[PDB]
C-alpha cells in the first residue's frame, strides 16, 4: 500500500504553537481550516480553538482544555496529557507557519485524489 500520509506531528507543532502563542491563530487559520486536520483528534482541539476565538476567548492550553472538559471530549482527545504533550510540541512557534503550511498540503492531497 501506499498508506496516505499525515502532517500528525506538523499538526501537533500547529496546535502546540497555537497554544504557545495565541496571535498566531491568524497565522495557522489563514492557511488551515478544522477540515484540513484528518486526525480526529487534532481536529476536535482545533475546533475547540475555533469555538473560542469566535467566543472572544483564549485558546491557550488550560482554557481549550477546560472548554473540551465543558464539552465531555478532554478524554475523547487523550485527556490533559495530550493536551500537555501538545502544549511542549513546538520549536517556540517558529515554524508554526510552516507547519500549517505542511497540514494544508496533506488536506490538498486529500482532496486532489482524482
Not at 491563530?25 to 469566535?54: G, K, S
Not at 477546560?66 to 490533559?80: A, I, K, M, N, P
Not at 507557519?97 to 494544508?104: K, T
Amino acid at each position: 500500500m501506499k498508506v496516505p500520509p499525515h502532517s500528525i506531528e506538523a499538526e501537533q507543532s500547529v496546535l502546540g504553537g497555537l497554544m504557545l502563542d495565541n496571535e498566531r491563530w491568524d497565522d495557522v487559520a489563514e492557511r488551515v481550516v478544522a477540515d484540513d486536520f484528518y486526525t480526529r483528534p487534532h481536529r476536535h482541539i482545533f475546533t475547540e480553538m475555533a469555538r473560542l476565538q469566535e467566543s472572544g476567548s483564549p485558546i491557550d492550553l488550560i482554557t481549550l482544555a477546560e472548554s473540551l472538559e465543558r464539552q465531555g471530549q478532554l478524554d475523547s482527545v487523550g485527556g490533559f496529557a495530550y493536551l500537555a504533550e501538545l502544549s511542549k510540541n513546538t520549536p517556540s512557534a517558529a515554524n508554526i507557519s510552516a507547519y500549517a503550511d505542511i497540514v494544508r498540503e496533506r488536506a490538498v492531497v486529500r482532496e486532489m485524489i482524482s
